[PDB]
């Protein structure tokens, strides 16, 4: 996260870390949506251009963390994966369209003051909150510049008007993506960066006080460059796929 601050303890209890076993390294961010399911970006698991194709057995999910490199004994939980489901139409060849994946944990995790699931939006919440100018929050242990943080970082970014998003790149934007960030002319900065992929973009409903995950960190061209924005997967538009694998393969 660039130009963000350290998070507070228990500020994002749904934040997850996808950790590789060998080498033992942070791979991506992810989020907890129930006691047995994690949501992340499909490119974190499959990206053939760079020969990336991970299997259950190669990953570990660390939940309840704050510190990036320490094993937070008695606070975090490490789970193994039972199954990984990538969106059948994830487009890694052209623009990472439908960059979403679900991971089923081997065993359910128990919630605590540091482990709690985020809500997935419903048509109405998406409708009222995904408006240009409204700010959302992104969290992650990714790069600070285009070193790394010791603690989870957070930054609040405004959603941008879709034309502005399309006119900032040469990549074809789809309705399954939205972009966020400040305009060169807004004197504020911030963006996600390498290592933040897969993590959550959330908003707090002023109607019922709950936090909803509206997006997943997907891509950007550089980090916090002026005139560019970060792109996020539109969770609500892919929710029927989510519903389907969950009630087709578990809960």
């Amino acid at each position: 996260i660039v130009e963000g601050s350290d998070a507070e303890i228990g500020m994002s209890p749904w934040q997850v870390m996808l950790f590789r076993k060998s080498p033992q390294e942070l791979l991506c961010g992810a989020s907890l949506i129930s006691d047995r399911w994690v949501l992340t970006a499909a490119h974190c698991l499959l990206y053939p251009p760079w020969d990336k194709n991970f299997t259950e057995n190669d990953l570990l999910v660390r939940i309840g963390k704050h510190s990036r490199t320490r094993y937070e004994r008695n606070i975090e939980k490490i789970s193994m994966l039972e199954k990984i489901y990538i969106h059948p139409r994830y487009n890694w060849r052209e623009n990472l369209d439908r960059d979403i994946a679900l991971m089923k944990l081997k065993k359910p995790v128990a919630f605590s003051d540091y482990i709690h699931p985020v809500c997935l939006p419903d048509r109405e919440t998406a409708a009222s909150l995904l408006q240009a100018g409204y700010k959302g929050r992104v969290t992650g242990w990714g790069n600070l510049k285009e070193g790394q943080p010791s603690v989870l970082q957070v930054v609040n970014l405004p959603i941008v008007e879709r034309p502005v998003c399309k006119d900032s790149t040469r990549i074809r934007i789809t309705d399954n993506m939205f972009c966020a960030g400040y305009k060169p002319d807004e004197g504020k900065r911030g963006d996600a960066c390498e290592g933040d992929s897969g993590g959550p973009f959330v908003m707090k409903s002023p109607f019922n006080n709950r936090w909803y995950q509206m997006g997943i960190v997907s891509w950007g061209e550089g980090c916090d460059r002026d005139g560019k924005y970060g792109f996020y997967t539109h969770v609500f538009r892919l929710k029927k796929w989510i519903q389907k694998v969950i009630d087709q393969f578990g809960e």
Binding site: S5, M11, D113, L120
Partner: protein, 36 residues
């Protein structure tokens, strides 16, 4: 899990559940065009 969803989702043990606000959530709420 699904819509509205999980049940107790989105209510943080250390904040909403105790009626405590984190330091920048107001920035979010203030951008959703005010609350009156």
């Amino acid at each position: 899990t699904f819509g509205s969803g999980e049940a107790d989702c989105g209510l943080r043990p250390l904040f909403e559940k105790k009626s405590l606000e984190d330091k920048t959530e107001r920035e979010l709420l203030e951008s959703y065009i005010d609350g009156r």
